[PDB]
Write a protein that binds this ligand. Sequence first.
Ligand SMILES: *SC[C@H](NC(=O)CC[C@H](N)C(=O)O)C(=O)NCC(=O)O
Ligand SMILES: *SC[C@H](NC(=O)CC[C@H](N)C(=O)O)C(=O)NCC(=O)O
Lengths: 236, 236
Amino acid sequence: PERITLYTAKICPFAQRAEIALAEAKAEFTPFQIDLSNKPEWYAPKVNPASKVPAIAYGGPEVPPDQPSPESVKLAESLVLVEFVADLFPNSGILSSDPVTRAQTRFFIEGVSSKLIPAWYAYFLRGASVDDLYTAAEYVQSLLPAEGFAVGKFSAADIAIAPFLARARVSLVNEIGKYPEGDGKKVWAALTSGKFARLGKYAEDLFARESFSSTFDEDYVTKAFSARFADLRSKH
Amino acid sequence: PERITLYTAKICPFAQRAEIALAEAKAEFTPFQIDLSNKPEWYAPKVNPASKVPAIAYGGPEVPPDQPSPESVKLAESLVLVEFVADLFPNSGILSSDPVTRAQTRFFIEGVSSKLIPAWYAYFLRGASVDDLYTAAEYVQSLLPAEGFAVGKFSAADIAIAPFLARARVSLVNEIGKYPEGDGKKVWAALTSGKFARLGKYAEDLFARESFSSTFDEDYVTKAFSARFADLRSKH
Ligand SMILES: *SC[C@H](NC(=O)CC[C@H](N)C(=O)O)C(=O)NCC(=O)O
Ligand SMILES: *SC[C@H](NC(=O)CC[C@H](N)C(=O)O)C(=O)NCC(=O)O
């Protein structure tokens, strides 16, 4: 493959998807951290007009990441980037070679993106009822096989969900959010035990994956979430 | 590939996506029309728990589509099915083999799914401002090359959008919707001329594609939409 520069941010779960994929592929790449509170003026016009992470500059000459060349192809959207790494590295295991398994992989990601992630942000940012979060977690849990990862062998499906389960845990166990203070620890426990014991086992296995743990700085993310969302209950 | 049975509906743009993909691949398959006004009792427990079209039953023994076998693999979600057909038919052209080109294909689809389709349904069903529909259309148009289809050769990107542009046109030119009566023909003209001339040429090219025209029944869709959505406007 041609050279890869990844524009990313430790706080951002969509960006961690891209980091996990590159780690699974053992890809050589140059990282560049974007401060989302203080973005470089060059980032939107030169790299990503949406002004978000993650993004990749692919190819072109060897340049510093803050001096991108217009000759590199600019790419964005986390789920596009994960399948891009999978297509660059066909022996990475990010996607099965099997058509049915690939479809089941993407079907799982659709459950994550359409049900679980919106239900989490509704609960976390707005204090919506936990009802939809349980419904979405039960649905995602029902797609899991008895053992292993989303379609057995680790794949893009696990990459898609792991950064969000990790930051849900960080938020809940620290009571960060707009939901009633004190419910957080109860909800994470409920999502990982009893009726949700399979989901709890799934989360354990995700968090133990080397490509996850090597791209997750739990202390940094916890501190960044606490600072950013401290005022959810108190701001007028 | 193994045997393919497609559960579909003429009215449904999501299902037309799959039909276009199968036509581009010259795939052998058995269609079955799902009565969306009176869905068969067996459809949700035996084929698709979400009770939506499209769905595919893949493989297993030869069965009547109204008696699906538990041995066939059941698949759903239109964009999953389109990539499934792509993966089954490597000479179909639905996806390029080139990693960058595949990424740009999926990136176009993300703009269609996240901006254009929600803005259309908001205008049609919710009487939202036309502003967001033009904004979303301008973004999609900005991704088009100077000539040709979304990434050059006809691909999953065009498959994703064509059924929705076709039904937006039918709705607008026949004044079906919650927007003020008489605005529709002017909005479709606006979306296909002037600042949207490129998008107008794209729509013309899409609707002339054989896989699109052979899977679109404009008389049926116009009559079906007129009956279904006759009450979006007050009688007073
Ligand atoms: S997590 C930080 C934010 N990134 C995204 O939301 C990416 C979403 C895309 N759809 C994707 O890659 O999947 C971010 O960069 N926000 C910009 C800001 O100004 O906060
Ligand atoms: S167009 C007919 C409806 N299908 C869908 O909405 C499919 C959406 C999926 N996300 C997809 O395949 O992309 C439909 O079947 N409606 C029936 C119902 O009861 O909702």
